[PDB]
Amino acid sequence: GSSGSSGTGEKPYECSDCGKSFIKKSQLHVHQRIHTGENPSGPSSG
Ligand SMILES: [Zn+2]
């Protein structure tokens, strides 16, 4: 019912597109991908 992500000390490589963070660069690189190609959704994009 009342529960969710339970992790202390957020992880590095924090995605500057949605929020998803990662420990290794590669992990983020593979992700950021989805955040590239189409129009920049949300005003939080330059
Ligand atoms: Zn992301």
From Swiss-Prot:
Name of the protein in question: Zinc finger protein 484
Zn finger spans (C2H2-type): 13-35
Function statement: May be involved in transcriptional regulation.
Family membership: Belongs to the krueppel C2H2-type zinc-finger protein family.
Organism: Homo sapiens (Human)
Subcellular localization: Nucleus
